[PDB]
Amino acid sequence: EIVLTQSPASLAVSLGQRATISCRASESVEYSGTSLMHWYQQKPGQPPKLLIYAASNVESGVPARFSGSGSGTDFSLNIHPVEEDDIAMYFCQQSRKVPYTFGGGTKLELKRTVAAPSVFIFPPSDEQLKSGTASVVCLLNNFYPREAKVQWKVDNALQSGNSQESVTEQDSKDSTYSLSSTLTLSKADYEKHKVYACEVTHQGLSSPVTKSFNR
Amino acid sequence: EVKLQESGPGLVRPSQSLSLTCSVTGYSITSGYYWNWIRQFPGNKLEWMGYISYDGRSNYNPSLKNRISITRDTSKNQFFLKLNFVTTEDTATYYCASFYYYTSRPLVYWGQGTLLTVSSASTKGPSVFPLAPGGTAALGCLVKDYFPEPVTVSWNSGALTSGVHTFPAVLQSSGLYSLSSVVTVPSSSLGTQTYICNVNHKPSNTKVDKKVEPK
Amino acid sequence: DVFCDSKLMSAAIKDNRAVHADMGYWIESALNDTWKIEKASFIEVKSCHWPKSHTLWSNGVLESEMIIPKNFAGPVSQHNYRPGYHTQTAGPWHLGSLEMDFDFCEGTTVVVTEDCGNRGPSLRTTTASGKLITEWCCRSCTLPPLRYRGEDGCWYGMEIRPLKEKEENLVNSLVTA
């Protein structure tokens, strides 16, 4: 299997600027002077759409701001000037050998200034505890960039494997993200401990922020 | 021109077989193109599964060799993907695609894609729990233990939209989905204004209003 | 200019059919209100000249009107004519092995309209990316359209062009003869 490595996994970009995505193959993709590598764009809820075929040929109907280059094992997609319609996922694909394979994908995201999150913690409701489970929620609101770390602490004991995260898409007006993390415990385990804390790590904070409550 | 359309069930039980149909319109499957199946996992990774040629010869990804079969019906201008078994790892969006054999073989045509969820869960309505708290305060509603997707959330029957973040649903170890929707609000209004979340889950006919008060 | 070897060559005409044949050639014409070429098979395309000894209706023939060009073993014959079509100098003869007839290529339409490009080198119905070109035109040709079929698919006569050729930068990905 020819393994395609795309870089970066996420690229922040300003409108009007130049964006370049890379895809590197584990072995040569060339065949009789043609590079068997293609580039696709994918919007949410849509199938991928062919942008570049044979790694420098712009498909008919594709805007002239897209271009492709490279040969051998190294290839590049180029978008200039970047427009709002280009905020999307991008994939590379090789057709030199079966099984055909795709790159891991590159998310073209709109750039903005660093924004620290506002952190809120929510204890489980009395209704849910009556039902017999306990959910603690920590909310990270309106932050940028995407990278953020949430660490749950129960009586200062670090939690592992019992939390789940969900992130919104980039907001249409301020380009920030919001994140939900849910800590799942049994009602009994919840009622046997006192201090529940959510520690948030983000580039926009000069120091990690903890939000906690006592049961 | 050429159009592809996938069809099949959106839900299949673990360890049962899977049968998908791609209907091709505007071109006979007996010339020109190779007809491929490609799936996309929740984390956006794409995996090429296999193809059948315009002469009726199939070729499969080794990762699927012993469980996959791609057939065709030339009188109905369709081809078919069969998985002898599926597990919860096979939950993905399944696309049909084609490439012209006498090219560099890019995937020029794609179907709209069909979502396939592999689960043993039954249809189940959600439980809605409140997420309760100076400055601006955050509140929300936890929509827990429902199947299948999706749920819809609004606030004050749609009159409150600014600052609302409804997160993508997460799949719990129970096989049931859970998500949160949150909204940020002036703390001064925590006494004076009513804040109610409206949750709709149509497969279970669930219409629930939950008032979110601090306690 | 070499003449084609005539040992295996033949020509024959009967009630509604005429055939100029060779080892690798088979050129069939018919009468429907008019004698005109209808189908042609080429195992291998050659560069010799078809001898007039084995040619029907070889008088007063315009080289500009012989569908199969003279330089490609085209019989100098009014049986080698098709109304609305001139000599296929730049057909897909590089295919080596091909079938020529008068029918639509798979999934495409052809309309007669002067709102069309002029004739040029024959084009495949699929671009270099594999996308199918659905709508085609001809300025002054007759239907059904002149069609070639070969290993890499279907091609159209010189007169037949994409209806929307000026759109989407189609010309950059066209496959041509």
Side-chain angles (χ1 to χ4, degrees):
Chain A
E1 158 163 302
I2 303 184
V3 179
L4 302 186
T5 310
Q6 264 185 261
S7 288
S10 179
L11 181 73
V13 84
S14 296
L15 304 169
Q17 281 345 299
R18 165 162 156 254
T20 314
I21 300 168
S22 171
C23 182
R24 177 191 258 169
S26 64
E27 56 180 274
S28 179
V29 309
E30 307 280 323
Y31 190 66
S32 164
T34 299
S35 319
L36 300 182
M37 178 77 71
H38 323 282
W39 286 96
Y40 303 83
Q41 184 195 65
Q42 187 176 33
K43 306 259 205 156
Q46 287 184 16
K49 188 226 275 185
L50 174 67
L51 296 174
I52 308 287
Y53 66 98
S56 52
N57 300 99
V58 186
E59 172 68 310
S60 87
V62 169
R65 60 182 178 270
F66 293 94
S67 54
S69 46
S71 57
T73 63
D74 294 290
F75 299 90
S76 271
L77 181 62
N78 209 85
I79 313 171
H80 178 235
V82 169
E83 295 175 13
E84 212 165 290
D85 194 71
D86 307 332
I87 299 305
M89 289 282 308
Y90 293 89
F91 296 92
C92 58
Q93 183 238 329
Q94 64 92 13
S95 56
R96 165 73 180 86
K97 287 185 177 180
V98 279
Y100 301 137
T101 52
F102 300 81
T106 291
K107 189 193 178 210
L108 196 57
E109 144 200 278
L110 182 42
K111 193 188 195 90
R112 64 147 288 149
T113 56
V114 176
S118 308
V119 185
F120 305 86
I121 188 165
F122 299 101
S125 62
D126 284 349
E127 301 96 298
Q128 186 189 24
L129 286 150
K130 299 323 95 204
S131 304
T133 42
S135 283
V136 202
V137 181
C138 193
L139 163 66
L140 288 65
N141 212 30
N142 301 324
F143 60 92
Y144 187 88
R146 164 64 178 87
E147 211 196 310
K149 179 177 184 174
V150 175
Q151 182 56 243
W152 283 99
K153 312 195 181 187
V154 178
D155 280 332
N156 307 282
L158 296 193
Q159 298 301 293
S160 295
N162 50 3
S163 71
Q164 291 191 283
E165 285 185 0
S166 178
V167 55
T168 58
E169 279 311 289
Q170 206 159 22
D171 181 83
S172 51
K173 301 139 164 114
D174 59 33
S175 317
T176 62
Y177 294 101
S178 281
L179 182 138
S180 206
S181 158
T182 298
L183 176 76
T184 299
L185 302 163
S186 65
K187 164 187 203 153
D189 281 337
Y190 177 74
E191 298 199 313
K192 283 193 241 213
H193 299 92
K194 180 184 174 183
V195 185
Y196 296 85
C198 161
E199 189 182 59
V200 166
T201 295
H202 189 260
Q203 186 194 311
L205 303 158
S206 56
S207 210
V209 175
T210 301
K211 283 290 149 74
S212 61
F213 66 90
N214 297 323
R215 178 190 50 82
Chain B
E1 72 159 329
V2 177
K3 165 159 94 171
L4 285 67
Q5 183 149 72
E6 306 88 343
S7 74
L11 178 60
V12 172
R13 265 65 171 99
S15 283
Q16 320 188 331
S17 68
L18 179 75
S19 315
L20 269 39
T21 304
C22 184
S23 280
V24 178
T25 291
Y27 200 92
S28 304
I29 63 174
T30 51
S31 61
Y33 296 88
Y34 279 27
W35 311 98
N36 304 248
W37 282 101
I38 302 155
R39 58 176 177 176
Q40 188 167 35
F41 292 107
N44 296 337
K45 185 173 83 251
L46 289 153
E47 178 183 41
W48 174 88
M49 307 186 70
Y51 64 68
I52 185 164
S53 67
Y54 52 80
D55 287 327
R57 170 72 172 286
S58 63
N59 181 281
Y60 305 129
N61 196 324
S63 65
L64 305 154
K65 69 172 48 93
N66 298 329
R67 70 193 276 224
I68 194 178
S69 147
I70 297 179
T71 56
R72 71 172 182 176
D73 189 343
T74 66
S75 69
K76 291 182 173 177
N77 213 48
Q78 302 169 325
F79 59 103
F80 309 92
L81 162 74
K82 234 81 158 200
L83 260 44
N84 284 343
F85 70 98
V86 289
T87 71
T88 55
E89 317 161 71
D90 296 312
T91 291
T93 301
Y94 286 76
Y95 293 94
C96 52
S98 71
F99 63 82
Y100 203 76
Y101 188 66
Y102 278 98
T103 59
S104 69
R105 296 157 190 169
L107 301 153
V108 59
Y109 290 119
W110 293 68
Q112 89 263 334
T114 174
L115 172 48
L116 176 83
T117 305
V118 181
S119 175
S120 61
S122 281
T123 298
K124 184 172 175 301
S127 303
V128 183
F129 306 119
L131 301 170
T136 88
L139 46 82
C141 270
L142 181 63
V143 195
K144 192 162 181 293
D145 297 330
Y146 64 90
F147 190 90
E149 288 214 271
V151 295
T152 42
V153 176
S154 59
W155 287 91
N156 293 342
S157 299
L160 181 54
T161 56
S162 166
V164 172
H165 289 119
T166 302
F167 295 95
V170 83
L171 181 59
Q172 300 162 109
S173 51
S174 68
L176 308 168
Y177 296 95
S178 167
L179 63 67
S180 273
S181 159
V182 301
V183 55
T184 48
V185 153
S187 60
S188 94
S189 73
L190 284 190
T192 302
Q193 177 66 53
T194 181
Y195 292 114
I196 291 169
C197 75
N198 329 99
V199 176
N200 268 263
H201 185 248
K202 185 43 212 92
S204 69
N205 264 314
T206 304
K207 291 187 194 168
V208 299
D209 279 2
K210 211 69 200 198
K211 175 192 190 153
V212 182
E213 33 194 60
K215 185 242 182 43
Chain C
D1 267 348
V2 52
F3 277 97
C4 291
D5 184 35
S6 96
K7 315 282 251 313
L8 300 77
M9 183 172 295
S10 78
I13 178 164
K14 228 180 190 317
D15 322 83
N16 292 322
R17 298 193 26 248
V19 174
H20 295 76
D22 204 358
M23 196 158 101
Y25 273 38
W26 180 278
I27 300 159
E28 186 169 338
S29 50
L31 169 66
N32 307 92
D33 305 47
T34 86
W35 282 99
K36 57 192 179 302
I37 189 168
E38 285 275 337
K39 68 172 231 70
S41 305
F42 314 88
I43 303 296
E44 230 185 275
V45 180
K46 32 199 178 204
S47 214
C48 51
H49 284 13
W50 194 277
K52 280 121 165 205
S53 63
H54 297 61
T55 306
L56 296 154
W57 204 356
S58 53
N59 61 282
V61 174
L62 290 295
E63 288 193 358
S64 65
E65 299 196 7
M66 327 167 34
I67 304 303
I68 307 166
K70 161 198 200 177
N71 44 296
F72 289 126
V76 178
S77 167
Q78 307 208 28
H79 287 285
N80 197 9
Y81 280 9
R82 187 79 177 198
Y85 295 92
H86 291 263
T87 172
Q88 299 291 300
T89 286
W93 304 115
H94 66 277
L95 295 176
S97 187
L98 74 71
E99 301 255 10
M100 177 189 95
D101 72 333
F102 294 90
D103 200 357
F104 299 92
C105 286
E106 185 69 40
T108 71
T109 62
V110 181
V111 294
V112 188
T113 168
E114 281 169 81
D115 198 25
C116 189
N118 207 342
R119 62 183 262 141
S122 278
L123 305 170
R124 203 177 69 192
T125 53
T126 51
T127 71
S129 79
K131 187 164 38 180
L132 171 74
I133 306 159
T134 290
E135 290 179 301
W136 294 73
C137 54
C138 68
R139 274 181 195 186
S140 35
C141 88
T142 58
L143 302 174
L146 207 158
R147 154 177 94 160
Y148 309 87
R149 274 176 306 158
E151 184 62 19
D152 70 334
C154 209
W155 304 56
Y156 267 136
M158 289 183 55
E159 287 81 359
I160 298 142
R161 308 272 107 191
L163 182 66
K164 288 156 158 234
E165 190 183 3
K166 308 175 107 74
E167 297 176 12
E168 308 186 69
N169 306 96
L170 242 193
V171 302
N172 297 341
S173 58
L174 294 175
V175 177
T176 310

